[model samples]
Target chain A: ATTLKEAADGAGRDFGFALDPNRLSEAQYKAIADSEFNLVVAENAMKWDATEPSQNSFSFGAGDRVASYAADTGKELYGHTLVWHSQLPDWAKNLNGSAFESAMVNHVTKVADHFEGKVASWDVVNEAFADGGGRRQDSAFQQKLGNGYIETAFRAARAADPTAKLCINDYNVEGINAKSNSLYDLVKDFKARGVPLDCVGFQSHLIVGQVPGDFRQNLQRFADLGVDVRITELDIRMRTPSDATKLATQAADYKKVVQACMQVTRCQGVTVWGITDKYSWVPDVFPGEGAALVWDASYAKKPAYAAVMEAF
Target chain B: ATTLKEAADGAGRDFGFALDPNRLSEAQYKAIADSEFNLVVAENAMKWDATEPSQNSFSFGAGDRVASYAADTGKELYGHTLVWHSQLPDWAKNLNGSAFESAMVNHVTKVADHFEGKVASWDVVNEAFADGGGRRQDSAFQQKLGNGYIETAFRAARAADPTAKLCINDYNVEGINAKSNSLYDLVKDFKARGVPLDCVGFQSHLIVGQVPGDFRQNLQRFADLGVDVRITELDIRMRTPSDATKLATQAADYKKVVQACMQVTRCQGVTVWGITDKYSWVPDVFPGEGAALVWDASYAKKPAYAAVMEAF
Candidate 1:
């Protein structure tokens, strides 16, 4: 009867993770989501194009399935994203000038309004920062509307929902680095300008053995900027045919990341990227970087699961 | 039969190309190599362990198979490598102190001498620099010998055959960056210090559309430093379901790079990655990122092949 969320909840923090809707049909996956976590994020469904594939067409079936499950089962739902560079439809990507801005604003408004009370928080702007401390070049939002597009999207998202906690999420910011520094500045900038930002979601996507030592301090620094913080998408990937040392290192990495969240007073919660290794997206992009999640493909709890539990 | 070398020789350069000998069993592939290249490098064979798998147990069977094929067929042999980080057997990788130094020197000496005058030049040191302006971080040689190992390998190759040219090769130097600049500094330093460094091999591995505009000028600057410049492992990979535009872009990419090499008087030759797409490492490692080489999966002359000939 006791579960991951129970331990995390009992210990005074929310523990949540992501779910790919296609894989949620499995009983074992459903059971894990139901018991182990207090909240869930629709990894793909809440994405801009996934919701509005063709202009006005809103396909909420996948997102609704996850949100409805979360709502019906007393679990909180976390809205992954309304705007991102990847997985966007060609029509949205090809939009120019004012149309680009309108399409973006409309998408954010409609999606956020749809998930208004369902999601506890919205990753209103996801992965807006590029490699190093710079604006993402590939993003049409950044290209056409300029960096002002960020503030614009957040404003639109706020207007639509006005209830869900609005957050900006990006990766490679586990500790103080160029990317993290850029994000901290942006969040601080928003705070200064009285922007609608309520939380900062650090996608603690890490490779095993490279976990920053000062990760806790980084989270604290972000939290110190007068906004709540959360570990949005935590995963420590290793080159597999993993040995005991590999698993142990991965577990340690997971623990460090979880503890980083626990240390910050305003670090509201923690959520791993995916539930099971077989279902994770790591293998798709990075070929050798499988066995990433706390649970194995067979849904067996890995050493990482115990490490994370111990951290909580 | 006019060879690829003849075309390059006519153009006042040496034309080199690469081959995976295991894939050379095909008549079409063999025909391309036989006519197109006067100089050849075994893509993987002749690597440290491939030559001496268990310490001194020399097995250049794969390397010799190709080298002999080149020699017997009136082609020049451009040796793959004598020293590098990667493709090392466990024994060489784990050795330290005098043993590490001894293994490297001995390996270089034996491998270089085995080919000797049969090869035009040896890529004595392969991929020595890291991503930026530093020696390769993961190099066992760098760990044990600091920055001295690069020169040591070149000197060892030089002593093995006083007549043979010794080269230091790496990728991402198609244009100038931190890695290329660092390598340039090292090359100049070696030249100044009488370090027996003769050539610099640029592995011009590129993606479609990202080809640097200043690649010609970069090669010219390197060549101006009084060393031969060669495009060792040249291939432009495109994402699959490659269109006419993709093929056209790839062809243009091949030309610009080859033109860069040919423009510099010291620029020696160009070597494409594989005989055919079917045998390319791109499809295996990059999954769906194929159509890299000058030939297609069916071993037909691709647009890139025509583009390359036009460049020569």
Candidate 2:
């Protein structure tokens, strides 16, 4: 079978996957990354904790490896999350008021500039909305920089890499709801104020058979607002010890998501959370859930893989 | 899961299966038909050879059993073709000119009248078009009665069962092509002439991943011609033994067919040729290919069955 990237690229979309730089040492993992995807993002290597562990101190080693690998392999680089609530270093989290805002913007600026011409896009802000509605109160940025933090990050990133598209990424915002509405309102405000927003990354971390009925409508609404949309961090999780039935439902779920994107005019592309179930984050985060990726532990393509292809 | 009949009926369409009266005696086989489907048709028992093995010597025993089962179970009955090129009795095939035409209309009138209240619809004519295009020449009716045979059969069926919808059925015309174009022309002509045609049945015997790209468009055009479309004798076959990936593809294939029907306003329903892969005609007809039906040999619901439900 042809690679997912090949099929998606022909349809005018990039097909990508999250990469843990460490996994690149494994030949099988590296092979799939090289051949099957046209875009790559570091799962955590480019995050707050990894890049800016201490205030005014920076590390670019892990992130640079992903960037170089993407360039060497002829793949587009998608910088994941310049600013987020979780995975923040202790030093950066302790700052308040102007200090915190400066640190956040500086971090965004440095990361965006470092990747410069290499990266195609950057998720400038991640998961800033509460689950039910409103802004997340627990976020350090929300506490210190107020509602303007997201705008600050986007503006900084845009200034650093003028060519790269700046996106706000989040989970559970794939469907239309209170939380997504909050984001939608923010996107609308940004568009009117000219805050340099380019896309909304719907981190479609879905449960099998739970894909929202209005997924396409939600994406089209975002696209209608004159911004690109993407299925970033796509994965459908089920309880471990997966059977044919659960996987079959998962396949259908994946197809539904991809098909929804294909129908929308400005929906950019899809990025799977991880390539194989062996490295999937579902088991670690959800405890009882696993087998959430397109490939099995043995790197065998699952039904979900075939489904994504069929959707293309 | 709720039965397929429940889901389909709620969606304003029938979910049906072709029944072999002999297999209905099996407790397991009978359970599915009684619960899962809202409509049933005889796989072969209602055909020419079974109902009229000899000229003027009609036998309704097998067909009657199926009609009774459908009636007793509160399911709709759809008659399986009154006039066809194949499965002809020697006595009927030998007749020529007006005698041949009379016998053909007599057969349809008799069967349609017998199950007038019980049968919801009738395939008044089957497989009249050739594979590439134009009329099929090898048929007894096509030879003696010429092109007028189909209209004659439909008129006879309508006279017998005023309430039942009459359909013209064929294969290889599910997609937009020469064969489907020919059928489209026929449906258009029938509409203009005020023929008794109410629906066109696309047999849809497809191979894995061979579902025509324009399946929905094809159905829509026919619907536009003022005739309802039905996916009759639906089955997606693949070379067996089945694997997880192939079954996955088969599942998506089935969903595509069902979804296509769901999208067309005038698509009445869908019916599989048989209830189980164990009795699927694909293996016998295609030699190495099997695993076509929604249910497996062991009576377990295949991925294709789950896909059908999801489509609903």
Candidate 3:
């Protein structure tokens, strides 16, 4: 395969990247993204704070840029994180009771309405579960709207954009553990109850050589629950090093993730967190972790990129 | 008061009638409809069978006539319903499992989207409960989508038209009873959970001299739950060959119904089932029962009309 997109298409799946529109101005960045990926998700432009900063006041300008780019480049646009505990504006976070629920619902509705026909899928609820397998207590939505907030958000997103696949995305759910089990229970319950859930996103933000032994089995379980499974936000990060062994381990991790998706019938595709290591989010957030992408800082293809392509 | 509209306006409430567009051709019918009421709901144009008779095949032409009339005549347009078991098409009824749920959500979202800015309120779910207080088993929605269908429909309607009031409506809910209590529990739960419910409709299809004594109290309790209450589809039916005694009792019943709404702060308004006795739906549906409306066959105000106006 010449590119990841070609390999994904050949394997009857999609290959995408988390898009940062600011990088679109860079020639090499735009060239790789436009030519290689068939699907794109906005890194920050579709978040609660970015789309609706205040109650009933919406700003879709930045999100529209990414949407337009996807449209012009013939790529499918995926909406990211409609209802989340993080990146929410102060007005949204401060609201409690019915006011909070109304604001949350209104925000989802308006944003989805703005991009109704343009989006192919949406991560309606993001990171709604705590690391310990319980509902995220810090989430204002969970606190106010109770445990049913995730279901409510999916329903609202489906209502606003019926044609778009409504999904719930979370990190640390790439393995068959407590957190993933919690999501599995939710997916099973939603399927039985006729909730408008179409997909479950496992944000495979793994550490190098730490990919779960049963990662493929976890994806299969969720897919068996009658929803598409996706490896969203896939990034195999490692400690800052120049060692060949660490790079090889990272490449193996990337290939394993892609192979797992390829083997599952309902596993739709994978989306790397960024186009290049130059702008990957791992280092800034994790302090010491870096080099978690398929491309190097020089905008050259890394071994991990070829591994992912070849696996597909 | 010269008209019920003026009387309702003075009382800070709305007075509306279920409008039949066939009557719009008659000068007197159009004159009374345009001049006497400040709000209008389509009699049949907005029903499920009328709007979407086939799967994904929508016909909004008839609905647009009523909406345009309401707009041109300076009246509030209330959407009759988006989810109901009765009057549903076979295509909608035959769907089971997720297909039924999807169809139901799609129907509501599409219908509400079509009239988003034009409507002031919508009966999101209508008549989901049986007369015996439990869910209506005969309903395809209840049979397939389970108990959560009503909540799902309300969320969809709100998402489709954020500014419009989302309401759940039913018959025999004008009085405090098992059926009403079921709705009351739903209202409380919905209010507590922030289910996007804005109103509860009491379809006052009553018999003469049988109006519930605690009707006002019931409206008040629902209002206390922080949702508006409305007297939708009001009509008092009696046996045929109506005489002075029956007319007098009917007038008192109409007065009482209107007065109950007037006494409650959150009782927004009352909408009579039809304009004139010449075309009331009561006789056709209820054998031997007739003379249900406030207007006589000659388009003259009946004693019930005077009673309603004086009560307002």
TM-score of 3: 0.51
lDDT of 2 by residue, A26-55 (tens): 789878887899899999999989988887
Tens digit of per-residue lDDT, candidate 1, span B149-202: 887888888889999888889998877799999998998898899899888888
- Estimate the lDDT of model 2: 0.88
Q: Give the TM-score of candidate 1.
A: 0.50
What DockQ results do all the predictions give, each relative to the true complex? 0.00, 0.00, 0.01
RMSD of each: 24.3, 26.6, 22.8
Q: What are the runs in model 3 whose C-alpha is more than 4 Å off?
A: A1-312
Residue B143 error for model 2, in Å? 99
Clashes per prediction? Answer: 1, 0, 0
Q: Which residue pairs clash within candidate 2?
A: none
Q: What's the CA RMSD of model 2 in angstroms? A: 26.6
Query: Candidate 3's residue-wise lDDT over B1-312, tens digit each?
Result: 798889999999988999876677577887888778999999999999999989998888668768766754568999999998889999887888988898998999999998888889999999999886989999888888889899899888888898999999999888889999988998999989989999999999999989999999889999999999999999999998788999999999999999999899899999999999899999889999989998888888878988998999
How would you encode candidate 3's per-residue C-alpha lDDT over A13-126 as one tens digit per residue?
988999887776577987899678989999999898888877887777668767766754557888898888898899877788988888878888999998898889999999
Arranged by TM-score, best first: 3, 2, 1
TM-score of A-chain in each prediction? Answer: 0.97, 0.98, 0.98
